[PDB]
Write a protein that binds this DNA or RNA. Structure first.
Ligand SMILES: *[C@H]1O[C@H](CO)[C@@H](O[C@@H]2O[C@H](CO)[C@@H](O[C@H]3O[C@H](CO[C@H]4O[C@H](CO)[C@@H](O)[C@H](O)[C@@H]4O)[C@@H](O)[C@H](O[C@H]4O[C@H](CO)[C@@H](O)[C@H](O)[C@@H]4O)[C@@H]3O)[C@H](O)[C@H]2NC(C)=O)[C@H](O)[C@H]1NC(C)=O
Ligand SMILES: *[C@H]1O[C@H](CO)[C@@H](O[C@H]2O[C@H](CO)[C@@H](O[C@H]3O[C@H](CO[C@H]4O[C@H](CO)[C@@H](O)[C@H](O)[C@@H]4O)[C@@H](O)[C@H](O[C@H]4O[C@H](CO)[C@@H](O)[C@H](O)[C@@H]4O)[C@@H]3O)[C@H](O)[C@H]2NC(C)=O)[C@H](O)[C@H]1NC(C)=O
Ligand SMILES: *[C@@H]1O[C@H](CO)[C@@H](O[C@@H]2O[C@H](CO)[C@@H](O[C@@H]3O[C@H](CO)[C@@H](O)[C@H](O)[C@@H]3O)[C@H](O)[C@H]2NC(C)=O)[C@H](O)[C@H]1NC(C)=O
Ligand SMILES: *[C@@H]1O[C@H](CO)[C@@H](O[C@@H]2O[C@H](CO)[C@@H](O[C@H]3O[C@H](CO)[C@@H](O)[C@H](O)[C@@H]3O)[C@H](O)[C@H]2NC(C)=O)[C@H](O)[C@H]1NC(C)=O
Ligand SMILES: *[C@H]1O[C@H](CO)[C@@H](O[C@H]2O[C@H](CO)[C@@H](O[C@@H]3O[C@H](CO)[C@@H](O)[C@H](O)[C@@H]3O)[C@H](O)[C@H]2NC(C)=O)[C@H](O)[C@H]1NC(C)=O
Ligand SMILES: *[C@H]1O[C@H](CO)[C@@H](O[C@H]2O[C@H](CO)[C@@H](O[C@@H]3O[C@H](CO)[C@@H](O)[C@H](O)[C@@H]3O)[C@H](O)[C@H]2NC(C)=O)[C@H](O)[C@H]1NC(C)=O
Ligand SMILES: *[C@@H]1O[C@H](CO[C@@H]2O[C@@H](C)[C@@H](O)[C@@H](O)[C@@H]2O)[C@@H](O[C@@H]2O[C@H](CO)[C@@H](O)[C@H](O)[C@H]2NC(C)=O)[C@H](O)[C@H]1NC(C)=O
Ligand SMILES: *[C@@H]1O[C@H](CO[C@H]2O[C@@H](C)[C@@H](O)[C@@H](O)[C@@H]2O)[C@@H](O[C@@H]2O[C@H](CO)[C@@H](O)[C@H](O)[C@H]2NC(C)=O)[C@H](O)[C@H]1NC(C)=O
Ligand SMILES: *[C@@H]1O[C@H](CO)[C@@H](O[C@H]2O[C@H](CO)[C@@H](O)[C@H](O)[C@H]2NC(C)=O)[C@H](O)[C@H]1NC(C)=O
Ligand SMILES: *[C@@H]1O[C@H](CO)[C@@H](O[C@H]2O[C@H](CO)[C@@H](O)[C@H](O)[C@H]2NC(C)=O)[C@H](O)[C@H]1NC(C)=O
Ligand SMILES: *[C@@H]1O[C@H](CO)[C@@H](O[C@H]2O[C@H](CO)[C@@H](O)[C@H](O)[C@H]2NC(C)=O)[C@H](O)[C@H]1NC(C)=O
Ligand SMILES: *[C@@H]1O[C@H](CO)[C@@H](O[C@H]2O[C@H](CO)[C@@H](O)[C@H](O)[C@H]2NC(C)=O)[C@H](O)[C@H]1NC(C)=O
Ligand SMILES: *[C@H]1O[C@H](CO)[C@@H](O[C@@H]2O[C@H](CO)[C@@H](O)[C@H](O)[C@H]2NC(C)=O)[C@H](O)[C@H]1NC(C)=O
Ligand SMILES: *[C@H]1O[C@H](CO)[C@@H](O[C@@H]2O[C@H](CO)[C@@H](O)[C@H](O)[C@H]2NC(C)=O)[C@H](O)[C@H]1NC(C)=O
Ligand SMILES: *[C@@H]1O[C@H](CO)[C@@H](O)[C@H](O)[C@H]1NC(C)=O
Ligand SMILES: *[C@@H]1O[C@H](CO)[C@@H](O)[C@H](O)[C@H]1NC(C)=O
Ligand SMILES: *[C@@H]1O[C@H](CO)[C@@H](O)[C@H](O)[C@H]1NC(C)=O
Ligand SMILES: *[C@H]1O[C@H](CO)[C@@H](O)[C@H](O)[C@H]1NC(C)=O
Lengths: 661, 668
RNA sequence: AUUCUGCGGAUUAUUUGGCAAAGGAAGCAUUGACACAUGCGCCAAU
RNA sequence: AUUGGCGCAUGUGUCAAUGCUUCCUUUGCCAAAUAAUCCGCAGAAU
C-alpha cells in the first residue's frame, strides 16, 4: 500500500484477503478498489485504532454486528457500491460513535425495524441507488442530529406525513431526493420533518401542478434552498410557486426544464429569494412584468435560458431587481440591446454577455445606455461577432474596471476615443480579433490600465512614435503575442516603470537583433518579472540586451534558433528562477554565458537541442547537472547529443568529464 | 586595356580617351563602341591595316574624312550608329568599294546631296534611321547595284514619289523599312520605280483606312511578299481597303495593334495567296461567316488579344459565330489567346480540316464547364495541340474530348478543375502524348483515372492537391509508356509501394514538397520506387525526409540525379547508396547532416559530376569530415561555393570554419 | 440469466497537445526588367 | 549657355524573380484526456 502517514491508503492492489502486515499504529484504512469476499468481523483486532475506513467498491455480501464492537473508535463507515441486499438493526448496534454512513450501490430494496436505534452522532447518511421504494426508516423518532439524508436515484413514489415522521426534532440540512419518480406529496409531508433546510428534487418529472401543489407542503417550513433541475415545467404561472408565499426562500433552481413560459408574477411570491438559476431553458420572452416579485434577488443566471423566429427580452424587464449585482446571459440568441434593457439594475456590478447576441455587429454609443446608472465593474462581450466599436460606446460605464472584448471580429483602428469614458478601467482583454490598427492616441484616454492583452489581433503600426502605449504608465501586464509584429523601434515601452510581464511569443522580431543599430528593446523595465520570447525568430541574442533587468524572474526563449551565445548575455539575471531554451539550435553550454543565471535557478529547460558531446561544450554543463538540484525535467530522455558520431543519441547526463580539463 | 583575342580586338566600355592602337595588328575586327571618342583619326589606322569590320558606334564623332576608307581597303562592315555626323557628301566613302554593311542610326543627318555612295557596290545592309531625313532620295542616278536592306524608319519622310525613289533601277530590296515616318501620301507609281521590292515595314506611320486602301494600288504588280502595318489607325476595314493588292502576290500580312473594330466582309477576298496573317492586339467586335472569305491559302492565323474587352455591365461581350472559319481549309495553326469570347459553339471550328495546332489560353470567360459538345467543331480537324490554360475550367464531363481523335499534346493547366478523374474524361484521346494538368483546385483520383489513355509519356500534376494516390492498384498502373511524371507540391499525405509498379520507362520523377517524411516503422518502410530500372533523375527535395532507410535505392543503376535538399537527414545508415555508381549529381543541401562517411557517400562520389551539400551542420572532427575533407582536396567533381557555404557547426574552435581548410594531417 | 466488483483489451465521437508538410500572407534582404530624376567629363547644331 | 548625343556614376519608384524569418489556415500522422459502445480474464449478488 501507500502506507501514508497515519491513514492507510491502498489504491488498487487487486488484493485477495483482508491484510494485516503493515503498521498497527493508525486511524484510517483504504481498502477501496479491491476484490473482497466479505468483511471479517474478527480480523479487526490487530487494528483496534481505525477511525474511518474506505471500504466501498468491493463485493461484500453481508455484514455482522461484530465489526462495530471490534472498532469502538469509528466515525466513518464507507460501504458504497457493495452488495448488502438486506439488513436489520443488529448490524450497527455497536456503532454509536459513527458520524458518517455511506451506502450507495447495495440494492437494499426494503427496510424493516429501526436499524439505527444506535447512531446518535451520525450526520451524513447516503442511501441512494439502493432500490428503496419508501423513505420510512423507522416508526420511532430517532437520528437526533442528522444533517444529510441522501435518497436519490431511488424508486420512491411519494412522501407521507407518516413514513417521514420518524424525524421528530431531527433537523436535516441537506435532504436529497433526485431521480425518484414521485407523483404525489401527501399533505403535511414536510410539516413532519423537524426543520428542513435544503432540498433536491432533481430529475423527478414534476408537472407544473405537482410543482404548484408540492409548494404548499413546503410551507411554514424552515426551507431555504430548493432544486428543480431536469423536470417538465414547460411553463410557470403566478399560481405555480404560489405555495411558497408562506416560506423564507433563499436560492431557487429551475435549470434544464424546457421552460417555454415564465408567466407574469410567477415569482411575486419570493420577496426573499436572493439567488435564482434559469440555466439551460427555452424561454420565449420576458415582458416587464416577468420578474415582478423578486425584489431581493442578487444573482440571476440566464445561461442558455432562451429559445432559438428569434427570442428576445424587451425594455424595463429588470426594473424590479434593484438589488441584483450579478447578471449572466451567456449562450443565447437575443437580437441586440435596447435603449432600456438594463434599466433599473442600479446594483449591477458584474455583467456577462458572452455569445449572447446575434445581430450586434456594431457597438453603438446607444448600446450600453441602459447600464448608465448601474455600478458596473465587469463586462464580458466575448463571442458576439463585434466587428466595429464607435466613439463613446462605453461612456456610460463610468465605473467599469474589467472589460472583455476578446474572441470577436473587431476590425477597426483604435483612435483613443473608443475608450472615452472608462474613467477607472483595470484591464482590457482584447485578444483574438481580425485587425487592430493602432495610432499614437489609441490608449491616451485610459491611463488607468494595468493589463492590456492583444494576442492574435494582427496588430499594425506599433512602430509609430511615441509608443501608442506611451500614456499607459500604471500598465503592468502587456501581451503582444501571435501578431507577427513586423518590427518595432526602441521608443516603444518608454516609461513603463511598472511593466512586469511582457509576452512576445510568435512575432518574427528576428532581424531586430545589427543593420541599422540593434533595437535596444526592453530598456529599464526594472520591475519586469516574466519575459516571454518563445518562437520569435530569435537567432542571436546580442551583447547585454538584458542589462539592468535584475528583478527579471523567468525568461523563455524556446522554439528559436539560438547557438551563438556571446559570453555575458545574462549577467543581471542573478535572480532568475527558470530558464527555457528548448527546441533551439544550441550546440554548447558555456559558463561565461549560462553561469550567472544558473546560480539560484529553480528549473531549467533546454531539451531537444543539438548537443555536442565534447569538452569544449557540455563539459562545464554536464557537471552542473551532476552537482546541482535545479529541477530539470526529462534530463533522462530529451537531452541527447547530436555530435560527434560515437556520442550521437547519447544521454547528455552520462558523459564522464573525468578525462577533461 | 582592350579584350583583343583572335583578330576581333574588342574594347568594351573602356572610357577610352584617344583611339588606341597597340600591337594586336594581326587581326580582322575591332570594337571601340561604348567609349568617349573625339573624332576618327583617318591616319591612326596604319598599325591596323587588317581590320574587316569595326564596332564604332555610340561615340561622339563629329565628322569623318574619306581617308579612313583608303587606309583600310579590306573593310566590309562600318558601324557608325548613335554618333554625330550632321552632314556628309560623296567624298567620305569614295575609297570604300568593298564595304558591304553600313550602319548609321543616330546622326541627325537631316539632308543628303549628290550621290554619296557612287562607290559601294557590295553594300547590302544600309541603316539610315532616326537621322532627320525629310526625303528618301539618295541620288539621281541608278546606283547601289545589290542592296538588300534600306532602313529608313523613325525619320520624318512626308511622302514617296516615283521620282525620289527611282534611284534604284535594277536594285532589288529584300527588306525596306519605313517605320515612324509621318507619311500622308504615296505619289502614284512610287513603287513601280523600285527594281524589285520584297519586304516592307510601315510600322507606326498613322495610316487611314483610305491612305491604306490607296497605298495598296501602288503596291501592285510589284514583287512584294511581306507587309507590316503595325500601330496605325485602321479602326476598320472593307473589301475595298486591301482591294489594291489583288494585283499582287502576298505571303504575310500584319495588322497588329490597330484598334481595328471592324473587319468588313471579304476585306481579304483579294489575298488568294496570303499564307500568314497577324491580327494581334486589336479590338474586333465579331466575325460573321463571311469575315474570312478570301484567304483560302492562309496557314497561320493569330487572334492573340484580337477582340474587344467584355463590358459585363454594358453587355458587350464580343464573339465569333459559327462557320466563320469554313474558308481556311488550309490553316494549321490557330491562336486565340487573351480574349473574352463567351464560349465555343456547335459549329465554331467547323471547316478547319488542316488545324493541327490550336491554342485557347485565357480565351474564354463563360466556359466554366467542358461539355461533350464543346470541341465538336474540331471533329474533322487533325488536332495535335490544344492549350486551354487559364480559362477557369472547373469540371470536365465524360467524352469531352472524344472528337479530338488525333490529339497528342493537351494542356489543362492553371485552371480551376475540381473533380475526380474516373478514366472517362480521357475517352477518345486515342494517341495522346502528354497531359499537362498542373495547378488546379482538386483532383481526386481513382483506380481507373488513366486506364483509358495508356499512350501517355508525360503527366504533370503539380499543385493540384492530389487525393487518393494510395489506392491499389496504382492509378498509374496502365500508363506503361510513361516516362516523365510529376507529383510535386501536392503535399501527398502518403503512398504504398504499389504505386509506380511496372513503369519500366519512368525516367524523371518529381516529388518536391510532399511531406513523404514518415514513409522512410509503420508496418515497415514503403518500398517506394521498386524496379524503375530506367529512372534517371529523382527529385525528393523538401519532403519531410529525415531518415533514408537501408537500400530503398537498390537496383536503380541508371539513376543519374538524386536531389534530397531541404530535408532533415543526418542519419545515413552505411550503404544507402550502392547501385548509384552511375550517379552524376547529388544534392543534400540545407539538411541536418553532421558527418560525411565513405561507406555511405563513397559509391556515388565515384564518377560524380557535381555535388551539393552546402549549409549543413558540419562537425569539424575526424570521425566525420575526415574522409570527406580529403575527397574535396583530391577530387575534381564540380562543387559550387565550397569556399563559403560549407562552414562547420561544431565544436567551438571549428565553428564557422571553411570545411575545406581542415588539416586531416593529424587523423586517420 | 439481470447486475455489482477488480484487472486488461477494443472501437467510435468530441477536445487538446506535438511533429512533418501544403496554401496564402507579412517583414527583411538579394537580383533582374523598366520608368522619372541627378552629378561629373566630352561634344554637336543654334 | 538653349536644345540635344554620348561616357561614367548616384538616386526614387513600379513590376517581377529568389532567399531567410514569421504568421494564419489546412492536410497526414502520433500522443493525452473526456465520453459512448464493446470484448476477455477473475470474483460475486438476487
Ligand atoms: C467572460 O466569459 C468567458 C466565458 O464565458 C471567460 O472565458 C472563459 O475563461 C476560462 C478560464 O480562463 C476558460 O477556461 C480555460 O481556458 C483555457 C483553454 O483550455 C485549454 O486547456 C485545456 C487543458 O486540458 C484543454 O483541454 C482545452 O482544450 C484547451 O486547449 C485553459 O487553459 C484554462 O485552464 C488553466 O488551468 C490552470 C488554472 O490556472 C492553469 O494552470 C493552466 O495553465 C490552464 O491555463 C482555463 O481554465 C474558458 O475556456 C473561457 N470560456 C470558454 C468556456 O470558452 C472570460 O474569461 C470571462 N471574462 C472574464 C475575465 O471575467
Ligand atoms: C500553351 O500556351 C501557354 C501560354 O499561352 C504556355 O504557358 C507557359 O509555358 C511555360 C510554363 O508552362 C512558360 O515558360 C517560360 O516562362 C518561364 C517562367 O519564367 C518566369 O520567371 C522569370 C524569373 O526571372 C521571370 O523573369 C519571367 O518573367 C517569368 O515570370 C521560364 O522559366 C521559362 O524559361 C526557362 O525554361 C527552363 C525551365 O524548365 C529553364 O531551365 C531555363 O533556364 C529558362 O529559365 C520560359 O521562358 C511560358 O512562358 C508560359 N506562357 C506564357 C506566355 O505565359 C503553355 O506552356 C503552352 N502549352 C504547351 C506546352 O504547348
Ligand atoms: C503572283 O503570281 C505569280 C507567282 O507564281 C507571278 O506571276 C506569274 O508570272 C509568270 C511568269 O512571269 C507567268 O507565267 C506564265 O504562266 C502561263 C500560265 O500557265 C503560261 O502559259 C505562260 O507560258 C507563262 O509561263 C504566270 O502566269 C504568272 N501567274 C499569274 C499571276 O497568273 C507574280 O509574281 C504574281 N502575279 C502578278 C503577275 O502580279
Ligand atoms: C421566514 O419568515 C421570516 C422572514 O421574514 C422569519 O420569521 C421569524 O419568525 C419568528 C417566530 O419565532 C419571529 O420571532 C418572534 O418569536 C416570538 C414568537 O413567539 C416573539 O416573542 C418574538 O418577539 C419574535 O417576534 C421573527 O420575528 C421572524 N423574523 C423576522 C424578524 O421577521 C424567519 O426567518 C422564517 N420563518 C420561519 C421560522 O418559518
Ligand atoms: C469620434 O471623435 C474622434 C475624434 O474627434 C473622431 O476622429 C476622426 O475625426 C477627426 C475629425 O473630427 C479626425 O481629426 C482630424 O480632423 C481635422 C479637422 O477637424 C482633419 O483636417 C484631419 O484630417 C483629421 O481628420 C480624426 O483623425 C478621425 N479619426 C480617424 C483616424 O479616422 C472619430 O471619427 C469620431 N467617431 C468616429 C470613429 O467616427
Ligand atoms: C462516365 O464516367 C463514369 C465511367 O463509366 C460513369 O460512372 C458512374 O455511372 C456508372 C453507370 O453509368 C456507375 O456504375 C454502376 O452502375 C450500376 C447500375 O446498375 C450501379 O448499381 C453500381 O453501383 C455503379 O454505380 C459508376 O459507379 C459511376 N461512377 C463510377 C465510374 O464509379 C459516369 O456515370 C459517366 N459520367 C456521367 C456522370 O454521366
Ligand atoms: C403577461 O400578461 C400580459 C397581460 O397584461 C398586459 O401586459 C402587461 C405586461 C401590462 O402591460 C398590462 O398593463 C397589460 O394589460 C400579457 O400582455 C399581452 O397580452 C395580450 C392579450 O391580448 C397578448 O395578445 C400579447 O401577446 C401580450 N403582450 C403584449 C403585446 O403586450 C403578456 O403576454 C404576459 N406575458 C407572457 C408573454 O406570458
Ligand atoms: C457582313 O455581312 C453581313 C450579312 O452577310 C452575311 O451575314 C451572315 C450572318 C449570313 O446571313 C450570311 O449568309 C450573309 O452573307 C452583315 O450582317 C448583317 O448586317 C445588318 C446591317 O446591314 C444587320 O441587320 C445585322 O447586324 C446582320 N444580319 C445578319 C443576317 O447577319 C454585316 O454587314 C457583316 N457582318 C457583321 C455583323 O459584321
Ligand atoms: C444554498 O446554497 C448552498 C447550499 O445548497 C449554500 O451556499 C452558500 O454557502 C457555501 C458554504 O457551504 C458557500 O461556499 C457558497 O458560496 C454560498 N453561496 C453563495 C452565496 O454563493 C447555502 O448554505 C444554501 N443556503 C443558504 C443561503 O444558507
Ligand atoms: C453618440 O452620441 C449621440 C447619442 O447620445 C448620438 O446622437 C447625436 O449625434 C448627433 C449630434 O448632433 C446627431 O446626429 C443626433 O441627432 C444626436 N442625437 C442625440 C441622441 O442627441 C450620436 O450620433 C452618436 N455618435 C455618432 C455620430 O456616432
Ligand atoms: C516574310 O516573313 C518574315 C518577315 O518578318 C521573314 O521570314 C520568313 O522566311 C523564313 C525563312 O524560311 C521563315 O523562317 C519565317 O517563318 C518566314 N516568316 C513567315 C512568312 O512566317 C521573311 O522576311 C519573309 N519571307 C518571305 C520572303 O516571304
Ligand atoms: C454527350 O454525348 C452526346 C454527344 O452529342 C450527347 O447526346 C446524346 O445523348 C443525349 C441523351 O440524353 C441526347 O443528346 C441524345 O440521345 C444523344 N445525341 C445524339 C447522339 O444524337 C449527350 O447528351 C452527352 N451526354 C449526356 C447523355 O449527357
Ligand atoms: C496608478 O498609480 C498609483 C498606484 O495605482 C495611483 O496613485 C494612487 O493615488 C494617489 C496618487 O495620485 C495616491 O493616493 C497614491 O499615490 C496611490 N494610492 C494607492 C496606493 O492606491 C495612481 O493614481 C494611478 N494612476 C491612475 C490610474 O490614475
Ligand atoms: C508504347 O511503347 C512502344 C513505343 O515505341 C509502342 O510500340 C511501337 O508502336 C507500334 C505499336 O502499336 C508499333 O507499330 C511500333 O513498331 C512500335 N515501335 C517500334 C518500331 O518498335 C507501343 O505500342 C506503346 N504502348 C502503348 C500501350 O501505347
Ligand atoms: C429530541 O428528542 C426528544 C425525543 O426523544 C424530544 O422530545 C425533544 O424535544 C428533543 N430533545 C432535545 C435533543 O433537546
Ligand atoms: C593618333 O596617334 C597620335 C600619335 O602621337 C596621337 O598623338 C593622336 O592622339 C592619335 N589620334 C587621336 C587624337 O586619337
Ligand atoms: C543593271 O544595270 C543597268 C543599269 O543602268 C541596267 O541597264 C541592266 O539591265 C541591269 N542589269 C541586269 C539585270 O541585266
Ligand atoms: C482474515 O484475513 C486474513 C488475511 O490476512 C486471513 O489470514 C484470515 O484467515 C481471515 N479470517 C477469516 C475471517 O477467516
Amino acid at each position: 500500500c501507500t502506507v501514508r502517514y497515519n491513514v492507510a491508503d491502498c489504491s488498487h492492489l487487486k488484493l485477495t484477503h483482508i491484510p494485516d502486515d503493515l503498521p498497527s499504529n493508525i486511524t484510517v484504512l483504504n481498502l477501496t478498489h479491491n476484490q473482497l469476499r466479505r468483511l471479517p468481523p474478527t480480523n479487526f483486532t490487530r487494528y483496534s485504532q481505525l477511525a474511518i475506513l474506505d471500504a466501498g467498491f468491493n463485493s461484500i455480501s453481508k455484514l455482522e454486528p461484530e465489526l462495530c464492537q471490534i472498532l469502538p473508535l469509528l466515525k466513518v463507515l464507507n460501504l458504497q457500491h457493495n452488495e448488502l441486499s438486506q439488513i436489520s438493526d443488529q448490524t450497527f448496534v455497536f456503532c454509536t460513535n459513527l458520524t458518517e454512513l455511506d451506502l450507495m450501490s447495495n440494492s437494499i430494496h426494503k427496510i424493516k425495524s429501526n436499524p439505527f436505534k444506535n447512531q446518535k452522532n451520525l450526520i451524513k447518511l447516503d442511501l441512494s441507488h439502493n432500490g428503496l421504494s419508501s423513505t420510512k426508516l423507522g416508526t420511532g423518532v430517532q437520528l437526533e442530529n442528522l444533517q444529510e439524508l441522501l435518497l436519490a436515484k431511488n424508486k420512491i413514489l411519494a412522501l407521507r406525513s407518516e413514513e417521514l415522521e420518524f424525524l421528530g426534532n431531527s433537523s436535516l440540512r441537506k435532504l436529497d431526493l433526485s431521480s425518484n419518480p414521485l407523483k404525489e406529496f401527501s399533505p403535511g409531508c414536510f410539516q413532519t420533518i423537524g426543520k428542513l433546510f435544503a432540498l433536491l428534487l432533481n430529475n423527478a418529472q414534476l408537472n407544473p401542478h405537482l410543482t404548484e401543489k408540492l409548494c404548499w407542503e413546503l410551507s411554514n417550513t424552515s426551507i431555504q434552498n430548493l432544486s428543480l433541475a431536469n423536470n417538465q415545467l414547460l411553463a410557470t404561472s403566478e399560481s405555480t410557486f404560489s405555495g411558497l408565499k408562506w416560506t423564507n426562500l433563499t436560492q431557487l433552481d429551475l435549470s434544464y426544464n424546457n421552460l417555454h413560459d415564465v408567466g407574469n408574477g410567477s415569482f411575486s411570491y419570493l420577496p426573499s429569494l436572493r439567488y435564482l438559476s434559469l440555466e439551460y431553458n427555452n424561454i420565449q420572452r420576458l415582458s416587464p412584468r416577468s420578474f415582478y416579485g423578486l425584489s431581493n434577488l442578487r444573482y440571476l443566471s440566464l445561461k442558455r435560458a432562451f429559445t432559438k423566429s428569434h427570442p428576445n427580452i424587451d425594455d424595463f424587464s429588470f426594473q424590479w431587481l434593484k438589488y441584483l449585482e450579478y447578471l449572466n446571459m451567456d449562450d443565447n440568441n437575443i437580437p441586440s440591446t435596447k435603449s432600456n434593457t438594463f434599466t433599473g439594475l442600479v446594483s449591477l456590478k458584474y455583467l456577462s454577455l458572452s455569445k449572447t447576441f446575434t445581430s450586434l455587429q456594431t457597438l453603438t454609443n446607444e448600446t450600453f445606455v441602459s447600464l448608465a446608472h448601474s455600478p458596473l465593474l465587469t463586462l464580458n462581450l466575448t463571442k458576439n461577432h463585434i466587428s466595429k466599436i464607435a466613439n463613446g460606446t462605453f461612456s456610460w460605464l463610468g465605473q467599469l474596471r474589467i472589460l472583455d472584448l476578446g474572441l470577436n471580429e473587431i476590425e477597426q483602428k483604435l483612435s483613443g476615443q473608443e475608450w472615452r469614458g472608462l474613467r477607472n478601467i483595470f484591464e482590457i482583454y482584447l485578444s483574438y480579433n481580425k485587425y487592430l490598427q493602432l495610432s499614437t492616441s489609441s490608449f491616451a484616454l485610459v491611463p488607468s490600465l494595468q493589463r492590456l492583452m492583444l494576442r492574435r489581433v494582427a496588430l499594425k503600426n506599433v512602430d509609430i512614435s511615441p509608443s501608442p502605449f506611451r500614456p499607459l504608465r500604471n500598465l503592468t501586464i502587456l501581451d503582444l503575442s501571435n501578431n507577427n509584429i513586423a518590427n518595432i523601434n526602441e521608443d516603444l515601452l518608454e516609461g513603463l516603470e511598472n511593466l512586469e510581464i511582457l509576452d512576445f511569443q510568435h512575432n518574427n522580431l528576428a532581424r531586430l537583433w545589427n543593420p541599422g543599430g540593434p533595437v535596444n528593446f526592453l530598456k529599464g523595465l526594472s520591475h519586469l518579472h516574466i519575459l516571454n520570447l518563445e518562437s520569435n525568430g530569435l537567432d542571436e541574442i546580442p551583447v547585454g540586451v538584458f542589462k539592468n533587468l535584475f528583478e527579471l524572474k523567468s525568461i523563455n526563449l524556446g522554439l528559436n534558433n539560438l547557438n551563438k551565445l556571446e559570453p555575458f548575455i545574462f549577467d543581471d539575471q542573478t535572480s532568475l528562477r527558470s530558464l527555457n531554451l528548448q527546441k533551439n539550435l544550441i550546440t554548447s553550454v558555456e559558463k561565461d554565458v549560462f553561469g550567472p543565471p544558473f546560480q539560484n535557478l529553480n528549473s531549467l529547460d533546454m531539451r531537444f537541442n543539438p548537443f555536442d558531446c565534447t569538452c569544449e561544450s557540455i563539459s562545464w554543463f554536464v557537471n552542473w547537472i551532476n552537482q546541482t538540484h535545479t529541477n530539470i525535467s526529462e534530463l533522462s530522455t530529451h537531452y541527447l547529443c547530436n555530435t560527434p558520431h560515437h556520442y550521437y543519441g547519447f544521454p547528455l547526463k552520462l558523459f564522464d568529464t573525468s578525462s577533461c580539463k
